[PDB]
Amino acid sequence: MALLGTILLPLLGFALLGLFGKRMREPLPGVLASGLVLASFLLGAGLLLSGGARFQAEWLPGIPFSLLLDNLSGFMLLIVTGVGFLIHVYAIGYMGGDPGYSRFFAYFNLFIAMMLTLVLADSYPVMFIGWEGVGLASFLLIGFWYKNPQYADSARKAFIVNRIGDLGFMLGMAILWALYGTLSISELKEAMEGPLKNPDLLALAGLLLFLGAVGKSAQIPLMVWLPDAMAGPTPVSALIHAATMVTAGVYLIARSSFLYSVLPDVSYAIAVVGLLTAAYGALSAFGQTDIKKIVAYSTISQLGYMFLAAGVGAYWVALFHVFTHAFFKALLFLASGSVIHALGGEQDVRKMGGLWKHLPQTRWHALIGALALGGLPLLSGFWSKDAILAATLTYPFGGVGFYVGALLVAVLTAMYAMRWFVLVFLGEERGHHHPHEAPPVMLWPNHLLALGSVLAGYLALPHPLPNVLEPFLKPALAEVEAHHLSLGAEWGLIALSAAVALLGLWAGFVFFQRKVFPAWYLAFEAASREAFYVDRAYNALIVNPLKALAEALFYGDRGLLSGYFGLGGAARSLGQGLARLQTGYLRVYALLFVLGALLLLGVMR
Amino acid sequence: MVVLAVLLPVVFGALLLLGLPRALGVLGAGLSFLLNLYLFLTHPGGVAHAFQAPLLPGAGVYWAFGLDGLSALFFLTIALTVFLGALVARVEGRFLGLALLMEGLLLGLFAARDLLVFYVFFEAALIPALLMLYLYGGEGRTRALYTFVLFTLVGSLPMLAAVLGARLLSGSPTFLLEDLLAHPLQEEAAFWVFLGFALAFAIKTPLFPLHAWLPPFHQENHPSGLADALGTLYKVGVFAFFRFAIPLAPEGFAQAQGLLLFLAALSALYGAWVAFAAKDFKTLLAYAGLSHMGVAALGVFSGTPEGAMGGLYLLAASGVYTGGLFLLAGRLYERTGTLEIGRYRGLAQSAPGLAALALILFLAMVGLPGLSGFPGEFLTLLGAYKASPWLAALAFLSVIASAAYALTAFQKTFWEEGGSGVKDLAGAEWGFALLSVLALLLMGVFPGYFARGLHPLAEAFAKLLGG
Structure with missing residues (x-):
């Protein structure tokens, strides 16, 4: 019962701020929200410190309500609660003079409670509950400023892709219910051990689960919905791209490691899709001229990295990158939000530049973030990305080409992060910012975020140095592990990766300070600006034809009703043909009478 | 007992029809709600409030009633929905008495413990529909009335031959469901009886080829949508399928199972898909109701008590929130005057909590977990996948179109x-709105409490398809 309070607090908060909501002063909704988030972080740390937690309540027959708090669930819980408290403070500061304060923080509380419902789950239908609740809260917040129709269709597309993923999830769950009949991850794991049966159906269920994970974490082909989340405010984009709603894609695989580990082909496919996602995100990031999109494509690339990690069976490595990423990408987003708070929401790159001297405490945030993402040798991002690069070779399935691929992706992340930083802070001035660029209480939690970004770091270190994350992550789940390792050569690889990352940083430095953009790079930047022409094809043969079919089925329904009409008209016509039988000439009536009587007399035999 | 709650909306609707005022309907629907809730609580089992009275000793007709696990919660759902429609109506044409009469008729329809009384209520439910349609609204009122009424009647009247065959060929001494179930029908005789049942029940399910009566019905009712809400409650087809159609003639259902599951799948998909193309609220909500009925019939037809319990739960809840959406569209009409979707955009800034109400209702429609739709939707998915994975998968290319529209x-x-x-x-x-959200949350987050009476019937009638 006590564990349920973690979810219940940012539900009572949501109800207060939604139902009554505007009966409060401006800071009070954010105050209540951040206080509930803090006293949920507290109660989660206290429950984990007590050894763990379990909760089971009566529900649908065969499908009870099961919450499990272990190391793996508590990891995500602490991350979400802490970053949520920080972003809640950053929103209290960042949200100002715009109505819907109470509504906004009620959306925040609901989001937090639903994500908790997701992670705290011993039954897959509760995971699905969290899935759809997070999708609804995302649809709501992305369309927070409703008075603009443009920032509505973004959330429309988001929830539609979300429900495609949810349908795949539902079908996989129906599969793992028809086979076993448990659908509770605890007993599902205890039943999946030993003599597996119908491996084809199991691989199919896992493939549909991965399909749902793709839509949630915006992998290829469902990548396209994520950039449009720029419609929502910057803290919304931070919470969506860093700590929640995408990390669930990795968490599902972490919990279903027992299923994905006995599926070699499915796991290899996950690795391929993760590599392609990293490649797309990196290649299409820098071409974007807006900060929000150029960060969203980087989120695509980094989630591709995580899914590459979890593809080869390196589950704790994917969680490592999740940790580092959830720090430094939230840093990036809140920094960018503060920056546009200085320019009054300018939200452009080409209209920027020369913000180094003018912006105290913000250029530092931006540089910390850009270096962590680019893979500065001594920074959390380096540890995570190169741990993935190593797990590529060390964990099964070979990772032969995936190593060089992810290394090029590290190069490209360095390049476009330097593009962001350079084109935003150096080498010109345009626009206006007189009075109040840097606020106290927005950059104040941003300080803590930059601190964590720098020092996330050494939780997972090569085996001479202490690896804290792997022993914490392996026992709760993903127990079966088959991975070799090396030394001496592993450190040569770490050194090669660090040197390559540094070369990528300075290469972006020179290329994006140049501003010349030679012939081929202009074409490439234009192509990346247009997302490699993906939506153009997606609306060509898919979306608009589905609309045409909906309209066609409407016309066909009208035509079916017309056929029913024709049946009735045939009935009336037959009726008047039979009513024509009586003309009024008595000879006609007598003949037809005698005729019918003779027919009767013949029938009697 | 049962007959009291069955008749209370009838007598209240009479007292509103001839007597005055409108206000009598609000308090009458409230008394009905309380009585149906009291009957829903302490429910021991089917015989809970059993009533048996003779009407035609020689022909074999008896007033036979009782509250099964199904009858109880459907009484509760109907009472609640009609009370909501009674307070919010804004029709005030003094015909809410017709709404209460139809409520009581649907109550007697559900509580029928013998075949002929069920058939009597099934045929009686036609009169108020054509009444509140004809004289209380609509431009094509006459044509839609004829279409809907003739479809229902062309289905219903041959079902009288079906029921006469089902009683006579089985040697059942009465029309009692107990007795009729005690004496099974034979092959190539249960075949024809089930075929006559399946036509009348599919055209009222509604399934794909037989749905053409639904959009015209919903368009030309009173713009407030009280008649529309009660017509959505008039999709009782699935119920009659599970209790009466299949157990009385499973031999024909053996051949018809695949066909009916396919029809349910394509109907759900077609409705949720066309609903996107809808340019008005009535068309959209009619196609959505078609999709939900396809899902429910799929769950029932799949065998697989999971699917059956899902279908029935989804049926009740969909009736609730679809009636809510209908009343909501009618209230927004009364305050605005139009049901077109394109016009009147700024609503959200002016409507503080009406936006939230419409949102909660559409969420319950698309079957969002935590709200009433998802339990039935998922249980039906499970049962259908158990029966035939292909039609379940195709049928559930519907949540996509659900969210879309x-x-x-x-x-x-x-x-x-x-x-x-x-x-x-x-x-x-x-x-x-308060009661709407309350009931939706209670039926979606706590599907354990509700539908507990549905599990025994589900597993028993699903095993009945076996040996």
Whole structure:
């Protein structure tokens, strides 16, 4: 019962701020929200410190309500609660003079409670509950400023892709219910051990689960919905791209490691899709001229990295990158939000530049973030990305080409992060910012975020140095592990990766300070600006034809009703043909009478 | 007992029809709600409130009633929905008595413990429909009335031959469901009886080829949508399938199972898909109701007690929130005057909690977990996948179109650029939305409490398809 309070607090908060909501002063909704988030972080740390937690309540027959708090669930819980408290403070500061304060923080509380419902789950239908609740809260917040129709269709597309993923999830769950009949991850794991049966159906269920994970974490082909989340405010984009709603894609695989580990082909496919996602995100990031999109494509690339990690069976490595990423990408987003708070929401790159001297405490945030993402040798991002690069070779399935691929992706992340930083802070001035660029209480939690970004770091270190994350992550789940390792050569690889990352940083430095953009790079930047022409094809043969079919089925329904009409008209016509039988000439009536009587007399035999 | 709650909406509807005033309907629906809730609590089992009275000793007709696990919660759902429609109506044409009469008729329909009384209520439910359609609204009122009435009657009247064959060929001494179930029908005789049952029950399910009566019915009712809400409650087809159609003639259902599951799948998909193309609220909600009925019939037909319990739960809940959406569209009409989706965009800024009410209702429609739709939707998915995976998968290319049409309508009705400005909420609409959200949350988050009576019937009638 006590564990349920973690979810219940940012539900009572949501109800207060939604139902009554505007009966409060401006800071009070954010105050209540951040206080509930803090006293949920507290109660989660206290429950984990007590050894763990379990909760089971009566529900649908065969499908009870099961919450499990272990190391793996508590990891995500602490991350979400802490970053949520920080972003809640950053929103209290960042949200100002715009109505819907109470509504906004009620959306925040609901989001937090639903994500908790997701992670705290011993039954897959509760995971699905969290899935759809997070999708609804995302649809709501992305369309927070409703008075603009443009920032509505973004959330429309988001929830539609979300429900495609949810349908795949539902079908996989129906599969793992028809086979076993448990659908509770605890007993599902205890039943999946030993003599597996119908491996084809199991691989199919896992493939549909991965399909749902793709839509949630915006992998290829469902990548396209994520950039449009720029419609929502910057803290919304931070919470969506860093700590929640995408990390669930990795968490599902972490919990279903027992299923994905006995599926070699499915796991290899996950690795391929993760590599392609990293490649797309990196290649299409820098071409974007807006900060929000150029960060969203980087989120695509980094989630591709995580899914590459979890593809080869390196589950704790994917969680490592999740940790580092959830720090430094939230840093990036809140920094960018503060920056546009200085320019009054300018939200452009080409209209920027020369913000180094003018912006105290913000250029530092931006540089910390850009270096962590680019893979500065001594920074959390380096540890995570190169741990993935190593797990590529060390964990099964070979990772032969995936190593060089992810290394090029590290190069490209360095390049476009330097593009962001350079084109935003150096080498010109345009626009206006007189009075109040840097606020106290927005950059104040941003300080803590930059601190964590720098020092996330050494939780997972090569085996001479202490690896804290792997022993914490392996026992709760993903127990079966088959991975070799090396030394001496592993450190040569770490050194090669660090040197390559540094070369990528300075290469972006020179290329994006140049501003010349030679012939081929202009074409490439234009192509990346247009997302490699993906939506153009997606609306060509898919979306608009589905609309045409909906309209066609409407016309066909009208035509079916017309056929029913024709049946009735045939009935009336037959009726008047039979009513024509009586003309009024008595000879006609007598003949037809005698005729019918003779027919009767013949029938009697 | 059962007969008291069955008749209370009838007598209240009479007292509203001939007598005055409108207010009598609000308090009558409230008394019905309380009585149906009291009957829903302490429910031991089927015989809970058993009633047996003779009407035609020689022919074999008896008033036979009782509260099964199904009859109890369907009584509760009907009482609640009609009470909501009674307070919020705004029709005030003094015909809410007709709404209460139809409520009581549907109650007797559900509580029928013998075949002929069920058939009697099935045929009687036609009169108020044509009445509140004809004289209380609609431009094509006459044509839609003839279409709907003739479809229902062309289905219903041959079902009388079906029931006469089902009783006579089985040697059952009475029309009692107990007795009739005690004496099974034979092969190539249960075949024809089930075929006559399946026509009348599919055309009222509704399934794909037989749905053409639904959109015209919903368009030309009173614009407030009280008649529309009660017609959505008039989709009792699935119920008659599970209790009466299949157990009385499974031999024909053996050949018809695949066909009916296919029809349910394509109907759900077609409805949720066309609903996107809908340019008005009535068309969208009619196609959505078609999709939900396809899902429910799929769950029942799949065998697989999971699917059956899901189908019935989804049926009750979909009736609830679809009636809610109908009344909501009618109230927004009364305050605005139009049901078009494109016009009147700024609603959200003017409507504080009407936006939230419409959102909660559309969420319950698309089957969002935590709200009433998802339990039935998922249980039906499980049962259908158990029966035939292909038709379950195709049928569930519906949640996609569900989100699509629901979000498009909600956005372009509320979210986009501010318009003139619209009334916020009426005092009765406050209790309406409050009770709506309360019931939706209670039926979605706590599907354990509700539908416990549905599990025994589900597993028993699903094993009945076996040896």
